[PDB]
Amino acid sequence: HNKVRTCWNEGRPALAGWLQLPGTLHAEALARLDYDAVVIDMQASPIDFGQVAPMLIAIELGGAEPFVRTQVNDPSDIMKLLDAGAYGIIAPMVNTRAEAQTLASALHYSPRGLRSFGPRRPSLRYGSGYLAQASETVVGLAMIETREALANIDEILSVDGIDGVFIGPTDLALDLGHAPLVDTEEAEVVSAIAHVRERAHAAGKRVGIFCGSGGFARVKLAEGFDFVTAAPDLAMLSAAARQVIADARA
Amino acid sequence: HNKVRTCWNEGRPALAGWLQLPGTLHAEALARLDYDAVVIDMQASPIDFGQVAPMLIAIELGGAEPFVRTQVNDPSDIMKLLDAGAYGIIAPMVNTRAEAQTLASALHYSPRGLRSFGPRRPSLRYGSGYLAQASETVVGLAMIETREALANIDEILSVDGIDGVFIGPTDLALDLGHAPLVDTEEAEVVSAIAHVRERAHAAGKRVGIFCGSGGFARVKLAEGFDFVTAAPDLAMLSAAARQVIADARAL
Amino acid sequence: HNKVRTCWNEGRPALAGWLQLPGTLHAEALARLDYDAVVIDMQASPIDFGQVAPMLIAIELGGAEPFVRTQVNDPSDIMKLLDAGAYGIIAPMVNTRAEAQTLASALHYSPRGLRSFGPRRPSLRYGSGYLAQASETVVGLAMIETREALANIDEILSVDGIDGVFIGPTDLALDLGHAPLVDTEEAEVVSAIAHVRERAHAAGKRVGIFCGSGGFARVKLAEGFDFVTAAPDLAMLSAAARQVIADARA
Amino acid sequence: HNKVRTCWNEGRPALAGWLQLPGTLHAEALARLDYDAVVIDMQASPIDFGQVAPMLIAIELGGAEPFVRTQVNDPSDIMKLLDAGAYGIIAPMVNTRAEAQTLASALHYSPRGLRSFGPRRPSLRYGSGYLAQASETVVGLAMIETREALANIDEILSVDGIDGVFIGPTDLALDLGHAPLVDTEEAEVVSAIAHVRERAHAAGKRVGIFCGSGGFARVKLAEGFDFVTAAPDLAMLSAAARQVIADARA
Amino acid sequence: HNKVRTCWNEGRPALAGWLQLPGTLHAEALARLDYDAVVIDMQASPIDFGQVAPMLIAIELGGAEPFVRTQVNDPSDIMKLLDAGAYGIIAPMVNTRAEAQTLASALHYSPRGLRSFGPRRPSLRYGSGYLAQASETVVGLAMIETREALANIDEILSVDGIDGVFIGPTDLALDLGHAPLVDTEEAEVVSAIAHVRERAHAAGKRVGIFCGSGGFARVKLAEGFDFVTAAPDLAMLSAAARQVIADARAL
Amino acid sequence: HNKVRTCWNEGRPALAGWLQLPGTLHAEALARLDYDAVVIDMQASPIDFGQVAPMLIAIELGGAEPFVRTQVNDPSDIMKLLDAGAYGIIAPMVNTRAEAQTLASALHYSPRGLRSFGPRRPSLRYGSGYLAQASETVVGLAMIETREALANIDEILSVDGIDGVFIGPTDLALDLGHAPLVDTEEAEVVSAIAHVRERAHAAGKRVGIFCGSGGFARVKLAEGFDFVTAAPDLAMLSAAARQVIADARAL
Ligand SMILES: [Br-]
Ligand SMILES: [Br-]
Ligand SMILES: [Br-]
Ligand SMILES: [Br-]
Ligand SMILES: [Br-]
Ligand SMILES: [Br-]
Ligand SMILES: [K+]
Ligand SMILES: [K+]
Ligand SMILES: [K+]
Ligand SMILES: [K+]
Ligand SMILES: [K+]
Ligand SMILES: [K+]
Ligand SMILES: [Mg+2]
Ligand SMILES: [Mg+2]
Ligand SMILES: [Mg+2]
Ligand SMILES: [Mg+2]
Ligand SMILES: [Mg+2]
Ligand SMILES: [Mg+2]
């Protein structure tokens, strides 16, 4: 079973890791922590497909559901990843109902979508009965990180075949005319985010958000978020080394 | 100029990072911090030659001195790394004078060593007049992490063409019959490390040490070690994540 | 000369291999067998471009025409591959005349198409006279694997600059509302396939099909197919190991 | 600062290298020569993203501004590269004002464009003030290599958010119905190129051109070109080895 | 637990696959079959360290024990593989007791061997209390494929810290002056293999063998070999394809 | 047939290219020129096993004989390259007869050597009846680039199973106390090279040499060297670019 979906079915949210660094060793290492999922970021990173492919295997062995935030909302790229044992897709810059249908169409075999049939790695996981349950095995979120996304939120949330939406808070803050700051106090950004969540849950759909600290993720979890990511590997690693250095040199 | 040798020339220590994770992005980032050097571990890691080459380029662009802890003390492996712009070499399990001579032979052109001439990247960095300073551009440390190497410390320090030694405290604890624990303070191991430190300085040679934490590294800097590494990327990242998860899930 | 095109000119079909596993050693090994071509599958596989590039070289040394089934019908991806010594392109999910023109446009230098000029590997094969013969050196098939493709078959086959079409029988079976089974007996799927072939040959164009067994490929060859692939490396390798195990344990 | 932009601000053109061969050693080596920039060609080459990523680092260490000629004018591919320390983008086959706006939109953060915010490598170069100066740090050229591009030159040059255009002379010669020859004497091709340059400078925008010899680049430099590339690594390497062989065998 | 050592503990053989082809997709797939272990050949293959690391992860996710046949019997190569989650080691051309001691030294922490401590992947799999069972988590086999190794079988079996040996029948045939043919039954070679088998069991040590076919492997299981590999991916794939082509082109 | 051995059989020299740059595109292109062979330098370069494998395939498709200058003279490294379709081996720093014997052992199947049997690519190229000609399909050269190797030239040439030697003039100049300069004509080094050439031919053995330029290579062909390499890709590319830049920026 999909571990995030089994979180949701058992009435609780998922906490996910977020990797910008390529490779299998930190991926597995983080996956064995009390993360329900680890997201590989193929957008704001040097991670291409050759590197993602072994990292999905690493996360699954680690005991976390492999998730990928794609470079772009592209049906054929999303389908390749599904076939490689990506079991969650987060599509950036989903701004319209049409783009969200485009996302949906990639996540589901006909007749519900137009997903190409060749399930190399999921067939090994789920076996010859994969077709029947393929849809439930995969989690699909549209990212909301523009003013336009915000305006089209109900129409995006109308789209059958996506589990929910995922807030890109830095892109969202920037396009709102504010500082691209993670975990921001900026009142407009904060109200926009709360508005996205309320609309999502009213549409009976799931909402997630990207966090830069445990402190902030704790708060989002308390406010009812279903899928919270904290924190990117490079940011935690950078912060950790800065502390090691200041402690060593004090 | 070698950033580590500059520290040493002004009679100050060098502080170095330590990578077990392949990739250029974290190698550049940590290199931009207040690290004098960044060591790529090619031993206890999934980093092979193909991954190491571009990480060297990134650490150098970062503005730290590129260091490698080799898989093994093998002269052909060491030479190929130096030609790929390793300016720092930490050769593991150097247990005998013969083995220090073998390290030494790789770090120096004839007649001082038998290093092969083909310095693809060094000649790009130091241009004309690289050869004239080749030996000083490179830093070479013999790793002490065995009973045998503890016994043979004086003969290892006698070898002209090495700068000094580098302690592996966990592997030394293990080989002295004790728990292989991070930043060990097992009394006997503490004694053996103190002895190595003193014999390095008595010999006019630099002494360095592997640290798993900022606390231990600060104490080693205070004990006058010349080269302190702190801490491995993977151990810093796992602890960082464990803490972010505990704060996220806290009542 | 293109070995598949020289098959066709000499009044006989091509039998091609089908690789989902990355690497050069099996590629060369299979290429030296009595395969006229080996197809690299960049869709239902972890094969990205970094891995495809050496595999094209391996197949050509092996003595088989390097063919690639792309992730997607994309002009710029197809052009890169041509430039890397892909000499056959099979484009998945070609559903409309417009998408088939899009395919055609990538395969041909102006004025016949809008192929970007920079023929890194074909220049080495064919020399400074490559331009004059570039078109004949490359084989272009549109895949037919949807109901929509089926409906638009004559219009697809109308498009100047494609050699023919290639049936995706599992995607085709699935979208027809049937089991995604290779080498299927399902009567609708079988009639649809026979209909695609008849229309193709009536349009004086070539038709191929993907097979999962030698038994089935034999039949398609007999029915007049011009380009038959059997069988994917992973499927033959999986089947072979299952036999080795049952023989060893009997 | 961007070294090409500082060339232009100081009233002089840029001479750039052009790499079709993957890897870091020749990249750094060429970057330390009296090249102001080195362009990595991801179109007419086997260079994918995994190989480009370390080559950008190599060029920057070498002391030349890392430039990339993309496979295709794609917003999400261009954005990934920016984030990887590509500081110049040359987009091939820019044929219309709309495609040039598409290019522009990728190069600039909102509100001037819709660039996704996650500046992994430029943040390390420029620091926390990167946002304010992001636009100036990057150089954007639209390639003109079709008749259609030629026809739409004023409209392309109208687009705010591109520095200028870059002539693809072989594709341009080919589509003009002439031989795809580098550094061509063909009178129509020569007049078209001179016309592109004149229109560019009249629009107060920058113009570049791809060259195959130092002799030709010298001439383009004299005619007022702002960004001249000479010559592709494989072509110089091939020519050099042919000379070595003829000298050795004489 | 080591799936091979579990087979052995219940006094049953282990059956293992054999990969010469790089990639994670076929390594996972074959690992999901009724193979106890899957050996990655890093000797007679284009598989280097960079490709081997993710194949280990895939075989383990597949649910077979990850095994490696090394390029050479070299302790630093063996240690780096064990730390990357090789739980099974087959070291080629082990011809002398000294060479078995050298294999042995890599497979065990001090004081039983001189394995370096840095178990990145093993500590993730076996968590707390890995060190307490480290030796049993790993399986190490000395390869017998020479005249010299045939002569020295008893002294190789005497070495405490190896589980047993692994026969290379083709390389042994070749070195005994005979055609290097797959699953050879050359009378003299058959005698030499039988002798190795008997001296392994007399010594209380496990004995294994390379098979190129399911037929030969079944006979070896019947002769009581403890570890049988069958058959190499590339040889299984070429024969599979040859047969599909012959059926496709048949009248 | 081996293109180098064919040259030799008709008593003509072989001319070879030399790659320090990873990638298949330039390896194919230069192989299509009038080069008899193309040597991949795995020593003074960032080329590891993973990059070397597909470059061999490209040089062979190019229509030149695939050659490798190894990182080190190590039999397991040499064997794995031959099985990956290296048909030409240049082993560096071969200084003693023992070291030539060690090269020799890797190039030949028993009983003439102890090469492991697993010829994945060679058996694809030469099909049935590869084994019958395996030794002649491969060319092996001992590199002379030291004082020691100059002294021991006669005992190195005595070793049956090597074709001859390959001079590294820069490394030989360096080790003889002189400037390590490209295509050196330092009088003493010229003497040492002439002596090596004469002792190779006296011994009935082939002699080859590293050239950094077409001029030097032409002179060596004229002095009757049997194998001349000219010139490294990276040195040819940097000079080519320097010249294109100087012409571009000229008044
Ligand atoms: Br945790
Ligand atoms: Br963050
Ligand atoms: Br066949
Ligand atoms: Br199939
Ligand atoms: Br210059
Ligand atoms: Br050109
Ligand atoms: K977990
Ligand atoms: K620094
Ligand atoms: K064939
Ligand atoms: K420069
Ligand atoms: K299994
Ligand atoms: K040739
Ligand atoms: Mg965003
Ligand atoms: Mg040398
Ligand atoms: Mg399909
Ligand atoms: Mg063009
Ligand atoms: Mg150690
Ligand atoms: Mg063997």
Residue numbers in the entry:
A (entry chain AAA), C (entry chain AAA), D (entry chain AAA): 1 to 250
B (entry chain BBB), E (entry chain BBB), F (entry chain BBB): 1 to 251
Q: Anything the authors wrote about it?
A:
To gain insight into the earlier observed activation of the enzyme by phosphate and a possible interaction thereof with the metal, phosphate was included into the crystallisation and soaking studies. Neither was the case for SwHKA. Docking studies did however reveal a potential docking site, close to H44. The docking does however support the earlier proposed function in the pyruvate deprotonation, studied by H/D exchange. In both cases 100–300 fold improved deprotonation rates were observed. This could be enabled by a phosphate in concert with H44. In the presence of ketoacids, bidentate substrate coordination affords M2+ A,S as the lowest energy complex and predominant state in crystal structures. Bidentate substrate coordination therefore seems to constitute the driving force for the transition of the metal cofactor from M2+ R via M2+ A,W into the catalytically active configuration M2+ A,S.
Here structural analysis of hydroxyketoacid aldolase from Sphingomonas wittichii RW1 (SwHKA) revealed a dynamic movement of the metal cofactor between two coordination spheres without protein scaffold rearrangements. Holo‐SwHKA forms a trimer of homodimers, in which each monomer adopts an (α/β)8 triosephosphate isomerase (TIM) barrel fold. In total, holo‐SwHKA contains six equivalent active sites; each of which is formed from amino acids from two different domain‐swapped dimers. The transition from M2+ R to M2+ A,S is induced by bidentate substrate binding and occurs without a concomitant rearrangement of the protein scaffold.
